[PDB]
Design a protein around this ligand. Structure first.
Ligand SMILES: Cc1cn([C@H]2C[C@H](O)[C@@H](COP(=O)(O)OP(=O)(O)OP(=O)(O)O)O2)c(=O)[nH]c1=O
Ligand SMILES: [Mg+2]
Ligand SMILES: [Mg+2]
Length: 538
DNA sequence: GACCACGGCGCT
DNA sequence: AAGCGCCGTGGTC
């Protein structure tokens, strides 16, 4: 059924890249399939110009490569997105092919044929699935186009600044390393947790608190080291060493080497079918975990800057997952807290502790805040105790007071788990599903871990759905204003706008995000503008 | 060179 | 006793 290039309109495309990252890949081959024919491009790059849309497996990646080459080729249907909506464990084309009727090979024509067959089969599985079809048409398919533009646009990085920082950090790492070795009485590989374990617990006389999950070694995690801050001077030094080497090896050193020759910018990938909950992920490099908490972390974040003549605009939803929880659970006291525009963590501290706000102390707000996020994950009293460094019994008390103030939260958790046990899956506000079979595991630890995954998903997933919908609504407004969407970090968007229009863009983006989908509580968005990512977050 | 599992840890 | 991706180590191929 081999036919001459080019294919008719509406054909499914297949393509092969020299490497997974579309901004860096050579397009090795290109083909298209339709109506019982397969068309193979004699020269892929030139053939790219013949296509109206990228329709097929991994359509976004081909679109990114096209945008890189100055071609406006938007992604359309992609069987990966259909499969992911059916079951978010469908994350790879290898797996999706095996499950839905083919094999993911290394040949373009075969990939084109596969895309066509998988689309037909998967489209059929979605029929009747009204809510999933709505997510596909109104969120996932249009979002893929937005993501392609974001990937191809990239973000500006101050490379010289990072190079300079590297040299300074190297000197400080040396000071810490040298002092650790002196305290140990000998040098060893401070990067090896296996060697460190022996030094701390065997050679020195330190008590080993916890064990590691898979192999049961004595843990040297920060949680353990923190508990040992007073046991020996070597511990604090190790904590400092860990912080510095983590940031140097993961951000300071690698990032400057990833600037693209043609754009002069750093380009991530936004993976659309990678998580169990419907969140996006980011890779090669991951720009969703750039440091921000510590002083050195903040120094790194300052390296992300706006193009000359432009500004960054950073918009963050305030406590979106807690607001989603209020809506899903219908808890009146939680809803009241938000509807009143009061500081969530301070206000929650008022409810527990039984004191008016203004009387809420710094430590009390901390407890409330830790609980406010912890409840989303199924955080236990033991864990809370360690996080706040308070007596186990105090931690227990705090958790009980929380559920006594917000009783419908516990009720929603229990209802969600019961329904999940029955149906075998849980769902977001929009109907995105996650299958969680271990809800009926006979091993308590396994079952309870499954429960925490299960009741978190509707919260995290609804928050993800809302952010995705916001991006889809916001993108065409930005293009009209000559602004750019650069990054998404789960509950935050980073935009780049010409200086003259930054204020207007910030106001507009804030309004689009706050009004994306009205809930029983208001969505609040914090917005900042600045020359670098840190200064744009205020 | 590449792959892996693991512990560990950065962000949401 | 939530969701990710990336680091170095140790082990392997
Ligand atoms: C602490 C914490 C934060 N986050 C995310 C949610 C948000 C983002 C920023 O965290 P914070 O700024 O620390 O949370 P916050 O804005 O609600 O608290 P504050 O009023 O003091 O500013 O990090 C989690 O997802 N899980 C957590 O446990
Ligand atoms: Mg905050
Ligand atoms: Mg792991």
């Amino acid at each position: 059924e081999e036919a001459p290039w080019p294919p008719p309109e509406g054909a499914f495309v297949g393509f092969v890249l020299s490497r997974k990252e579309p901004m860096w890949a050579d397009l090795l081959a290109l083909a298209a399939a339709r109506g019982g024919r397969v068309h193979r491009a004699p020269e892929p790059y030139k053939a790219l110009r013949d296509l109206k849309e990228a329709r097929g497996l991994l359509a976004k990646d081909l679109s990114v490569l096209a945008l890189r080459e100055g071609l406006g080729l938007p992604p359309g249907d992609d069987p990966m997105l259909l499969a992911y909506l059916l079951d978010p464990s469908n994350t790879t084309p290898e797996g999706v092919a095996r499950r839905y009727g083919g094999e993911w090979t290394e040949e373009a024509g075969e990939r084109a044929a596969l895309s066509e067959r998988l689309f037909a089969n998967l489209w059929g599985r979605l029929e009747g699935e009204e809510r999933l079809l709505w997510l596909y048409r109104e969120v996932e398919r249009p979002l893929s186009a937005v993501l392609a533009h974001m990937e191809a646009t990239g973000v500006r990085l101050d490379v010289a600044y990072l190079r300079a920082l590297s040299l300074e950090v190297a000197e400080e790492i040396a000071r810490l390393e040298a002092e650790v070795f002196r305290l140990a009485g000998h040098p060893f590989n401070l990067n090896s947790r296996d060697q460190l374990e022996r030094v701390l617990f065997d050679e020195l006389g330190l008590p080993a608190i916890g064990k590691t999950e898979k192999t049961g070694k004595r843990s040297t995690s920060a949680a353990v080291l923190e508990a040992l801050r007073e046991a020996h001077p070597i511990v604090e030094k190790i904590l400092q060493y860990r912080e510095l080497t983590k940031l140097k090896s993961t951000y300071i050193d690698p990032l400057p080497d990833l600037i693209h020759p043609r754009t002069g910018r750093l380009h991530t990938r936004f993976n659309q079918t990678a998580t169990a909950t419907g969140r996006l992920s980011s890779s090669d490099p991951n720009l969703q975990n750039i440091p921000v908490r510590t002083p050195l972390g903040q120094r790194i974040r300052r390296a992300f800057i706006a193009e000359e003549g432009w500004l960054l605009v950073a918009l963050d939803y305030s406590q979106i997952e807690l607001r989603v929880l209020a809506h899903l659970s219908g808890d009146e006291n939680l809803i009241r807290v938000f509807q009143e525009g009061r500081d969530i963590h301070t206000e929650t501290a008022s409810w527990m502790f039984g004191v008016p706000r203004e009387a809420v102390d710094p430590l009390m707000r901390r407890a409330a805040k830790t609980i406010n996020f912890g409840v989303l994950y199924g955080m236990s009293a033991h864990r809370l105790s360690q996080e706040l460094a308070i007596p186990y019994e105090e931690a227990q008390a705090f958790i009980e007071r929380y559920f006594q103030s917000f009783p419908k939260v516990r009720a929603w958790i229990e209802k969600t788990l019961e329904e999940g046990r029955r149906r075998g899956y849980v769902e977001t506000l929009f109907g995105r599903r996650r299958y969680v079979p271990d809800l009926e595991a006979r091993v308590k630890s396994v079952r309870e871990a499954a429960e925490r995954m299960a009741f978190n998903m509707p919260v995290q997933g609804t928050a993800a759905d809302l952010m995705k919908l916001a991006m889809v609504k916001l993108f065409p407004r930005l293009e009209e204003m000559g602004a750019r969407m650069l990054l998404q970090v789960h509950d935050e968007l980073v935009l780049e706008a010409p200086k003259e229009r930054a204020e207007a863009v910030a106001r507009l983006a804030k309004e689009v995000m706050e009004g994306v989908y009205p809930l029983a509580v208001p969505l609040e968005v914090e917005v900042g503008i600045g020359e670098d990512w840190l200064s744009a977050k205020e």
